[PDB]
């Protein structure tokens, strides 16, 4: 509950501007650890924030996935809808 659905297109070089920590191999939830100024993650509707817990990536439940599996899902450009990365997050 209290979930926020964010869509964002990458910059011209394929970057979104956020960092993540966590994943199944780290025994902790996937959390946004940094959002860089002026990047898609900082300028989206609403902003992606540090501490937000990632629940879905492009509709996919990532609970049992490792950190690097989550990184590849973020970079999987063909799983985006209309070029937008979709994140379903829980604010801290």
């Amino acid at each position: 509950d209290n979930l926020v659905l964010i869509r964002m297109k990458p910059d011209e070089n394929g970057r979104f501007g956020f960092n993540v920590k966590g994943g199944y191999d780290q025994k902790m939830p996937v959390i946004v650890s940094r959002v860089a100024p002026g990047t898609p993650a900082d300028l989206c509707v609403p902003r992606l924030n540090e501490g937000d817990q990632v629940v879905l990536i492009n509709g996919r439940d990532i609970a049992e996935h490792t950190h690097d599996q989550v990184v590849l899902f973020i970079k999987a450009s063909c799983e985006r809808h209309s070029g937008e990365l979709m994140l379903l997050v829980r604010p801290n």
């Binding site: 920590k21 650890s33 690097d68 990184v71 970079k75």
Partner: peptide, 13 residues
């Protein structure tokens, strides 16, 4: 990993 910098278990996307 996946052509993104990883350090301290944190990846830049």
């Amino acid at each position: 990993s996946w052509e993104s910098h990883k350090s301290g278990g944190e990846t830049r996307l």
